[PDB]
Amino acid sequence: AFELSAAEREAIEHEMHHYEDPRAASIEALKIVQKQRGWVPDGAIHAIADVLGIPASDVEGVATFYSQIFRQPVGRHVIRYCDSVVCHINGYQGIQAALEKKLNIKPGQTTFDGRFTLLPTCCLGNCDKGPNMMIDEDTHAHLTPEAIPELLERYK
Amino acid sequence: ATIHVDGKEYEVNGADNLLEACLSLGLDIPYFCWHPALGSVGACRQCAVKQYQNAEDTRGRLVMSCMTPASDGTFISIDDEEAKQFRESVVEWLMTNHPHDCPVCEEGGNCHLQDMTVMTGHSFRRYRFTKRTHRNQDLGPFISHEMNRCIACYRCVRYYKDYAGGTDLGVYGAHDNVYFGRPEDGTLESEFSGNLVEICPTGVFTDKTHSERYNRKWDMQFAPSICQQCSIGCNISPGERYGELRRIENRYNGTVNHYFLCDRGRFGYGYVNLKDRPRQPVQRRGDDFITLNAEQAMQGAADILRQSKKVIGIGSPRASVESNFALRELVGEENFYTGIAHGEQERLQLALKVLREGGIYTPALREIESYDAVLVLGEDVTQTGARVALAVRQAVKGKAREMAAAQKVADWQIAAILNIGQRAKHPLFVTNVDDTRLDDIAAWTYRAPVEDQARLGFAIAHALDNSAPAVDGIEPELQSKIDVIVQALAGAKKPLIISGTNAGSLEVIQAAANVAKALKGRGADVGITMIARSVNSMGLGIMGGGSLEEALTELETGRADAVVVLENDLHRHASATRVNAALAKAPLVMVVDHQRTAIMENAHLVLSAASFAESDGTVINNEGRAQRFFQVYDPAYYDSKTVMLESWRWLHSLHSTLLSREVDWTQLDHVIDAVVAKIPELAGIKDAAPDATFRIRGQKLAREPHRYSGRTAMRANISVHEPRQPQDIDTMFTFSMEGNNQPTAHRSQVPFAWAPGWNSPQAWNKFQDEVGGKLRFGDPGVRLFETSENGLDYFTSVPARFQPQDGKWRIAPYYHLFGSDELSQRAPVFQSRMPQPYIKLNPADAAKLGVNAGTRVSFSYDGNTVTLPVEIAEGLTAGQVGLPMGMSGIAPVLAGAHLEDLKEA
Amino acid sequence: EATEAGLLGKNIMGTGFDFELFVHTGAGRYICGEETALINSLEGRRANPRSKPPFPATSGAWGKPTCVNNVETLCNVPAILANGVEWYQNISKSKDAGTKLMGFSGRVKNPGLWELPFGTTAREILEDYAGGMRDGLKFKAWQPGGA
Numbered sequence A: 001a002f003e004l005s006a007a008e009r010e011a012i013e014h015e016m017h018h019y020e021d022p023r024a025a026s027i028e029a030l031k032i033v034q035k036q037r038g039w040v041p042d043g044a045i046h047a048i049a050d051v052l053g054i055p056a057s058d059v060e061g062v063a064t065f066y067s068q069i070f071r072q073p074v075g076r077h078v079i080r081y082c083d084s085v086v087c088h089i090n091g092y093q094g095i096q097a098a099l100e101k102k103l104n105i106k107p108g109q110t111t112f113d114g115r116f117t118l119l120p121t122c123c124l125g126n127c128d129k130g131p132n133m134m135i136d137e138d139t140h141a142h143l144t145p146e147a148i149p150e151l152l153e154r155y156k
Numbered sequence B: 001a002t003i004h005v006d007g008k009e010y011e012v013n014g015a016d017n018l019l020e021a022c023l024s025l026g027l028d029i030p031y032f033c034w035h036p037a038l039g040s041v042g043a044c045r046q047c048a049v050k051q052y053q054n055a056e057d058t059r060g061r062l063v064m065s066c067m068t069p070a071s072d073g074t075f076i077s078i079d080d081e082e083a084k085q086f087r088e089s090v091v092e093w094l095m096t097n098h099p100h101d102c103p104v105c106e107e108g109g110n111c112h113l114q115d116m117t118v119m120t121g122h123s124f125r126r127y128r129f130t131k132r133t134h135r136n137q138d139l140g141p142f143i144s145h146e147m148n149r150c151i152a153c154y155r156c157v158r159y160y161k162d163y164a165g166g167t168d169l170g171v172y173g174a175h176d177n178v179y180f181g182r183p184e185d186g187t188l189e190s191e192f193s194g195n196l197v198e199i200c201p202t203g204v205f206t207d208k209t210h211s212e213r214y215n216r217k218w219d220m221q222f223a224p225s226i227c228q229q230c231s232i233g234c235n236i237s238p239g240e241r242y243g244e245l246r247r248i249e250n251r252y253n254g255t256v257n258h259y260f261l262c263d264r265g266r267f268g269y270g271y272v273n274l275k276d277r278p279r280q281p282v283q284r285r286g287d288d289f290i291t292l293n294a295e296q297a298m299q300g301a302a303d304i305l306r307q308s309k310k311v312i313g314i315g316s317p318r319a320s321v322e323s324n325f326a327l328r329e330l331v332g333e334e335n336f337y338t339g340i341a342h343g344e345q346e347r348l349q350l351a352l353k354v355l356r357e358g359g360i361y362t363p364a365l366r367e368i369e370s371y372d373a374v375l376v377l378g379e380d381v382t383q384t385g386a387r388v389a390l391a392v393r394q395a396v397k398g399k400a401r402e403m404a405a406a407q408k409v410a411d412w413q414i415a416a417i418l419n420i421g422q423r424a425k426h427p428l429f430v431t432n433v434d435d436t437r438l439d440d441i442a443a444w445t446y447r448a449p450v451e452d453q454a455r456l457g458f459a460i461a462h463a464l465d466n467s468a469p470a471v472d473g474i475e476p477e478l479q480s481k482i483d484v485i486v487q488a489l490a491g492a493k494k495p496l497i498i499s500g501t502n503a504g505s506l507e508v509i510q511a512a513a514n515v516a517k518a519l520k521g522r523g524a525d526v527g528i529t530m531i532a533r534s535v536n537s538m539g540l541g542i543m544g545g546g547s548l549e550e551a552l553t554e555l556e557t558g559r560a561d562a563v564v565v566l567e568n569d570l571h572r573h574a575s576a577t578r579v580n581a582a583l584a585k586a587p588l589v590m591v592v593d594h595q596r597t598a599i600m601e602n603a604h605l606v607l608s609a610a611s612f613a614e615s616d617g618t619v620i621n622n623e624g625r626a627q628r629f630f631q632v633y634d635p636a637y638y639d640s641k642t643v644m645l646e647s648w649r650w651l652h653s654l655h656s657t658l659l660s661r662e663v664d665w666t667q668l669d670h671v672i673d674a675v676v677a678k679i680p681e682l683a684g685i686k687d688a689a690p691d692a693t694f695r696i697r698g699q700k701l702a703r704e705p706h707r708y709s710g711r712t713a714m715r716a717n718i719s720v721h722e723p724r725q726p727q728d729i730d731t732m733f734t735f736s737m738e739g740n741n742q743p744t745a746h747r748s749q750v751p752f753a754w755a756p757g758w759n760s761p762q763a764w765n766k767f768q769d770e771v772g773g774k775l776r777f778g779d780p781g782v783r784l785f786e787t788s789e790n791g792l793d794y795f796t797s798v799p800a801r802f803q804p805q806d807g808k809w810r811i812a813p814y815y816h817l818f819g820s821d822e823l824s825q826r827a828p829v830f831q832s833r834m835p836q837p838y839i840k841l842n843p844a845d846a847a848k849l850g851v852n853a854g855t856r857v858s859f860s861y862d863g864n865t866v867t868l869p870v871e872i873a874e875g876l877t878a879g880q881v882g883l884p885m886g887m888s889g890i891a892p893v894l895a896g897a898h899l900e901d902l903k904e905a
Numbered sequence C: 001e002a003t004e005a006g007l008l009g010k011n012i013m014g015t016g017f018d019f020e021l022f023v024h025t026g027a028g029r030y031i032c033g034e035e036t037a038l039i040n041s042l043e044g045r046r047a048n049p050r051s052k053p054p055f056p057a058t059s060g061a062w063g064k065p066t067c068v069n070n071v072e073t074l075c076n077v078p079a080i081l082a083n084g085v086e087w088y089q090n091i092s093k094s095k096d097a098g099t100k101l102m103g104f105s106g107r108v109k110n111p112g113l114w115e116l117p118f119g120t121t122a123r124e125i126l127e128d129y130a131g132g133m134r135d136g137l138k139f140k141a142w143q144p145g146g147a
């Protein structure tokens, strides 16, 4: 059902060259597969294990330990709004309510169009400019609840 | 080292941690994540004690006793109020998410979590919120999975992955949603997965075979017994209820099998509970099958045997020493035949000669773990002698142990040891006809026909010692790999050479003996291990006798007109057509057995023998250790018409009725005395266990726990009158709880481990002199022979290289842990676990035949055409065909034989 | 750029010291910042921390000797070796040598980060650099060094 592409395998072997042990490229291999496919499917665990020479249970334990390695299918764009204490003081709850009103989803769910997946992430390391959001690779700071129905409309 | 626990002074080992040192002293500290065989990781935080700086310190500090060395002049407190409160808090935190499951949990009454909850004194719930729940997985036919009961102690992953070497069990997830299981549903692939039911302190991993017919631990009747499913002789505690064998627990033997069994021994016991077993003597008269009691069966058998001219007896390696000796006494020494084939007997006698005349020490199974390099020749250990494979894995991890010891890291700090020794390991060189399960840790695997494996052994022995015979025709790359083996073996302080009779090659055993002799001559502390086939193969080899072919010759020539077959189906050791013709020619066949075999249709009389569960006896280990197995239950307690006697009892009473026309149901000690009087090299079996007059302060040893229930109701449907308690005249055990099972009792045979406050398998800690060590008054069993003062000579019979000849196909044996053993493959739960019968072919041979993967080919052996589907074996070599030994229709005697007319059906 | 300029790689500055520098991007767990759990996550494992002793100095990444240091410590090092010991000891009259990145965040007038010597009081940081609390807010609590 799953087959690694040639570019994925070449990137995984290139990451394997950087470490003493080929096991150490497991997180990078999972992130490569996730970057190419949006998430890590079930056959990808055994594919990564077969390339790296480690058991599939080790790959699955790594993939389920880390929250950024997605293991269920997600939308085209992953909204990751900050949840920690400084953005709590700066009022992330208004941002979360605005996102849930605009998308009609609870956190951890995906829209029916498959466009957005809403996730409460950890502290984004941008606390002096809070509240913070991280769409797929872009960090948006100084969030206001009125800027969400404009911010979400440039991610088609 | 000196420690002070609660103001009391104790002398301990300073290389131990505080938890194991205090448990060895009889002190009770709760613990979950520590195991004596696994080391300390400090996960569960349950073992907290209070350590003080010195004697004049009162504040102290809470430390993990499993992670704290028992160094000299240590001051700790277990019953400190802060420590007790913290331990109770840890139990409470575990209790917050634990399901309300104890009545419907198979672990109940046998649960370490229950014991530690009671031990800390936590019985009041104040958590009011929800409990996390988990989905379960299907782990196969043996292990049932119930993830709600997990306390995240990480014992399963540490055992299964770090100890046993398995790859398909892991921990997944995070903060409090940690999941212990497989990546997906499927059968657990390790041969030692069954030890999870004792490793897991809760009811997550449970014995599914026991769960089908579940009963609680206090309701079991236990006995100390020996596993009958291969030659390793692991100590077991079979437990029964309502007349059927319910469970096989690990019985701790610090010398053999300490905490662990393999899955064959743990789950292949189900043949005892089969409903087609003979439960009463049956005499065939015409087409009728008259049922007899013991007396008239003995009288009729004695009359017919007295009327016959010559009676021969065919023993078995399944039967005990006493049973084979009783058959040998009944028919005479010259008329007694070992039930195995001539080649099998030759290899077994050579293995015995190497073990007891080669001058090289043969290690016990626990001692295998302390060797520095392993060479395995021809023996597929994981499928034939599995616990040796587990011990070899430990011996391989010994290098990481040594590297960590060089950095002053304690022996129990397992995570630091595995971090220091990353992938460094002791050398392992395995040789087989195909790939093995030891290839993941093997430094090198040689896949070759058994001639070439023997040639590799002879070449290694010649390279170590030039006085050994040389091998002509070694390729330069194979020579370089041989030199790698020689450099690894010559530098080892304790090299270990493992071989056995399962390869079907005498030359492999000769090559292994040559390698062991060459390493002995260089001053190495070399050990040699031989893996036999069956539970009492070595005992039958020591007793001796003719081969099965000689017995069949006697039957076919008419020189013998009466044959007594003891516990032997005879189709695993000879061709079925020849056996059927010989048994049809003989005018009297008497089969003494406990399983319904195919030769009972020719049998004039069938004596319903007892299995290991219903009998006592002695079996001889593959290392030459005599071990007693004791009867678990009386078969006639529930069904009064059951006449199921021990085989030695049947044959001794038959001999007595043949001589003096009176039956004589003897005693086990009398038969053992007869063995040690007539066969002097079996004289060690007297000291294997004490006789039936042994008492612990005047009382016998109990088979069942004190809280054994249903004493006046279990048989009440048969009759409201409670019957007589069955009397055991053979052994020191009683068929009741009116007996002793104290942990401090001066004995070595422990039927089951129970201590007050310790209902789980952790109760074995109380029965040991030190935790993880030996039993307190010595492990049971005695070595029959010592190491010889002088060794053997070099075997100069170097075989030639294998040549694929057209029309012939050399049969390469493939062994299966589930299927190759006879009685275990008769067990119903093995049928789901049994692989489909595949005939293994090289890609080139299948291309020559035009055969693809999965098409059915027909081959004729001994004039019998049988059809199997083809599996492509890349590791096999050309001119060889791979067959699964011991399955339906494929006898293990076919190993090494040739094949004819291999064509697509 | 440092590799193509000869500052990284083989035979740096003609001394003979070989050093290769890699960037390993994580996958988002807070426990990965703990140094032994950081070593476990660098080895491609689940980021469980390790018990000490042994410390990473003797048995760290892949069993080898390993030293884990924060970004700001390794940014303090070059000024120490470019100016000297006495300069680093003569910029603050406190038991904690050198400067430190300090700053107030959360409902203040100017949330941000400033480099200040050790021994700077938190009140002057909040009032001068952060500007104090915002309009119509009363200061009730503070955390000095994170969550």
Ligand code: SF4
Pocket: B098, B099, B100, B101, B102, B105, B106, B107, B108, B109, B111, B112, B113, B114, B149, B201, B202, B203, B204
């Ligand atoms: S695992 Fe133990 S404590 Fe939990 S439900 Fe089963 S018997 Fe009860």
Ligand code: SF4
Pocket: B149, B150, B151, B152, B153, B154, B155, B156, B157, B180, B199, B200, B201, B202, B204, B205
């Ligand atoms: S499944 Fe059992 S052995 Fe494994 S962590 Fe959970 S309680 Fe411990």
Ligand code: SF4
Pocket: B227, B228, B229, B230, B231, B232, B233, B234, B257, B261, B262, B263, B264, B265, B266, B385, B386, B387, B388
């Ligand atoms: S290794 Fe052999 S003796 Fe031991 S449990 Fe397995 S089958 Fe039984």
Ligand code: FES
Pocket: A082, A083, A084, A085, A086, A087, A088, A122, A123, A124, A125, A126, A127, A130, A131, A132
């Ligand atoms: S608390 Fe939200 S970015 Fe740090």
Ligand code: FES
Pocket: B019, B030, B031, B032, B033, B034, B041, B042, B043, B044, B045, B046, B047, B064, B065, B066, B067
């Ligand atoms: S037994 Fe010591 S912390 Fe688990």
Ligand SMILES: [Ca+2]
Pocket: B614, B615, B616, B631, B646, B730
């Ligand atoms: Ca008996």
